[PDB]
Every structure is written in structure tokens, then in C-alpha cells.
Ligand binder design. Sequence first.
Ligand SMILES: CCOc1cccc(C(=O)O)c1N
Ligand SMILES: CCOc1cccc(C(=O)O)c1N
Lengths: 284, 284
Amino acid sequence: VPRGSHMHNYVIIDAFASVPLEGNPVAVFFDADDLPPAQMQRIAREMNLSESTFVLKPRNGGDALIRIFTPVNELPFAGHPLLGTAIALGAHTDNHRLYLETQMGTIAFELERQNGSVIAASMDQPIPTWTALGRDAELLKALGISDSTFPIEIYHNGPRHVFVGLPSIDALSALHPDHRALSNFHDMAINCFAGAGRRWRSRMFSPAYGVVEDAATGSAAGPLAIHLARHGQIEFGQPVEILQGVEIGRPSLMFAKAEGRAEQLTRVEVSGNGVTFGRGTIVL
Amino acid sequence: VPRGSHMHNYVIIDAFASVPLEGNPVAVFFDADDLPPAQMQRIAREMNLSESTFVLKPRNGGDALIRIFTPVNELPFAGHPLLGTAIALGAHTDNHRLYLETQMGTIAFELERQNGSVIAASMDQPIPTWTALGRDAELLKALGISDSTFPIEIYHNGPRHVFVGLPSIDALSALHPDHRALSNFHDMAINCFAGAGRRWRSRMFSPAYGVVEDAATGSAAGPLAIHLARHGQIEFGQPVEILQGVEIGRPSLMFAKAEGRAEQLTRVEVSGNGVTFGRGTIVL
Ligand SMILES: CCOc1cccc(C(=O)O)c1N
Ligand SMILES: CCOc1cccc(C(=O)O)c1N
């Protein structure tokens, strides 16, 4: 029974995974031009996934304009939701590349297909800026630890991401943050990392963005590759694999590479697999 | 593209609401007899709603057997998920009454239809047992308040529900619990209430059941009617309306009535409206 003038089709994509029930889900809503943004926000709250996206007609030469909502706020750019959106739209085109307009500009995607299905995509992210957070004691207390292995810096590529280093994967898994205390950190996500060489583990916490713990924070993957190189953990330009979401039962694998030098970054690439979990229609 | 031997259809019901985007969503999965329970749990985690339910063939004379999963655990009975399941199954029968088998026994529902759609249902809940929680100082500290207006008691009807009284609706809305501290309260939900006469407000918090704050805790509505009468706030048998979820943007209206006396309860009725938000199919 419709409860509006338009129904909307949607697909659920598990981003940063090659099998369903892993990765980070995103609900992608098609033909969304009739929806007021306040209604988009309410739909995102209804789905209760880390993000829902809304596919709109392009306005600046791209293939589509995408608006991105967490359960509580709109974001101007986000990695897992746009990866899932690109994979979902990939089912309706033969094109190798897709150009998704966002509030941070047009994001270029390269799609990978196997046996007629889009199985993965790679994006060029906005090049982030960064500075010291300057709230170290407060943040470490909220996380329940005494120190970060590296300087605590906050990066901006639309959302904001703070990085806190842990000395081992066991120490990362042992974190039990005070999420009420973390709620004093507005308009940012807290990304905690540990690992070595090519392979890193992450956990992300963001009351500001409406989620206790997120499974795959794609817009943090590019900045982490920069952060690791700036602090001598990898060489600049080394590709990394970032496994997030293990503790919450949503293992997600993000691939990232940042080209250049800290003061002259030229590209920040993030890629991953994705798979369709479901499809449906909503009544408004 | 299927990722299993069976796909499953589902519907999303907004329980305890008469308009979509209000109430508490539940995902109801049909034809679920092929799914192992570990897979049901993973699907519930994927949907990330307070509950997903799975419709199985009946084994004890009912219409269906329903298994109920939060994002983190199975429950033996729950009110909003069974209300939504009854409404969803109501679309596929003409019957006025539906009998849903659960781990707590067979739950009887009366369906209300208007213009060919099921718009509401009423259930007879298990009669709860109760005792003093005996953890008052710990719980009040976690909630961030100094006292409860009434004795803090824990009720069992499958899940467990603790009730903490607040002196005003403003005081209820002002709560900002320490959810990490609440995680020391296992196998229970914390229900905080305020109001007067026929009309009450509630908020529910349950890290044990995988949710920071739930919008409509239907298995707490029956016990609250008992609790209010035992503590002199209403007469035994007075119907109450319980509005939950306002602060999180998911206003949900639960109707409850408990018949008898505290020591000889004969019926605990909970009812509400529900509406279909969406329908779809998953790949496994
Ligand atoms: C709402 C919590 O989750 C997130 C917040 C910010 C960014 C992303 C992303 O994928 O870049 C994200 N999944
Ligand atoms: C998982 C958090 O939510 C809940 C917990 C326990 C019971 C119910 C219910 O509706 O009776 C519920 N919605």
C-alpha cells in the first residue's frame, strides 16, 4: 500500500566485502529526486544503517548526484556509501567508469566486473587536509587508554577523521570506549589503528555521526595511508590493506594508496569489493 | 544474483505507529525454514533493526513459529517484533485471529482491518514474574540520576525489563546514560518512565540486547501497566497509553492493560497500530 505519490526502489550493498553478511551495508535509493532532504534523513533513520544514499539527477556533468545520510546527519562525502552506490549503479550501465557528484565535488570510480556483475570499484578521494586535534588527554580518557603510539591528528575530506594508534591488535580489540564521553567530539569520527607493513586493523567510533562503532569507514582509509606514511610506518605510496569491523562481526577490507609526498599529494585511491545483499521497494 | 540455494522475501513493518517512519521497525523474513539460526542471527545483524523475525512452519498447532533476533542475541518473546510479524502475516490471511508460536508459548493475536489492510493488532502477553533488582545504586549511577520515584524491580516475560521512575517528562528527556556502565546489566533492558493517569512516556536502553535506545519495547508495556498499578499510579486494570522513542525521533504508541490483582493476574494485553514501510528480497 503506497503512503506517498512515489514509491522508491532500493538495493542493499555490503561494501568492502566479497560475500554477503560481511562488510558495511549501505541502502541505495533510486529515483530520489522527489524526496525532500528532511525525508531522506528520516528514511536513513528508518533503515538504521551507517548510511543510506539517494540517487539524483546530475547537475555538473556527472552520471548522478548522490546525497549521503547517516542515521542522524548528512555527510558531504563518505567512502563506503559511495562505493556501494557505484556498485549498485554499475548494474544499470556498461560503462567502465562512473562519475558521482557529491558536495565535495565529482568523485571518479573505476568499476570491475566479473561474469556480468560489478564486483568491486576504486575511487579517487578528495585530498585531505589535517592538523593536530589538540584534545589528547580528553580523547585518550574517553577511549580508556593512556597514550597514542603516534601524534593524534584530525583529517578533513568532507567528514573529519581522527587517528589514534594502538601498540598491538590485541590492544585495539580490548578497547571499550566511553561513548558518552566520545559524544563531546562533534563532527568527527575516531579511528583507532594497529598493524604493520602492508596490513592494518582499524576500529571506528562516532557518536557525532550516529554510530557506536562503524564496520568500514572508507573515507578514513585514504587518510590512514597518509598518516602511516607521515609517521614512518610505511613508505609514501605503499598500498595498504585495512581490516575494520572484526570485533563487531562485520569484517571489512579496505584497500588504500596515497601518491606523492605529504606536502604534494597527487592522488588518494581507495578500493574494495562489494556485493548485493538485497533489493526492495519502500512505500514513499 | 543469488548467494544461496534460497532467497527470502521480507517486509519492513513500523510497529506501534499508524504512519511510516514512526514507530519501531521490524524486518519479517518469510519462508525461513531453510535458514540455520546462526544465519538468522547474522541476517538480524545485517538489517541492524532492533529485531528481525523469521517465519517458520508451526509445530504445536499455531499458524506459524516465529524466531526473534536482536542484532546480538535471540529472544524468546518480544512485543514490537511479534506485533509487526502478526501484521505482516495478516496480509496473507482473512483470519481475525493469529496464533504465533514462540519459545514462551503460543501468543494469541486479534487483527484489526480497514479497507482490506491490517492496521493494528492486540496480543495476550505471558504473565510476567518480578523481583527487586537489588542493584539500585549501580543502576542509578549508570543512568546519571540520584533516585527512582518507585522501587526498582525487574520483570520477566522472556526478556527481562527493569523499571526506573522519573519525576517528570523533562527529567526523562534529560537522561544521558553511561551506556558502557549499562553494559554490566546482562540479559535485561532498562525502561525509564514518567507521566500521569492514562498517559505515560518511556525510554528504553539495552546494551545487553544490542541497542543504545529502543523506540518501542512492546514486552515492557504489559509489565509497566502492572508496575504502575502495584505502585499506586493507576488502578489495576486501567488501560494506559505509553509513548516511547520521542527523543530519538521514533515516536511509538503502545496500549496496555493488565487484568486482575498483582497476586492473581489473568491477562496482560498489549496492542498497537502498524504499517508496512517496505518489502524486498535478500540473496540468501
Ligand atoms: C556514520 C558512520 O559511518 C561513517 C562515518 C563517516 C564516514 C564513513 C565512510 O564510509 O567514509 C562512514 N561509514
Ligand atoms: C533489542 C532491543 O529491543 C527490544 C528488546 C527487548 C524487547 C523488545 C520488545 O519489543 O518487546 C525490544 N524491541
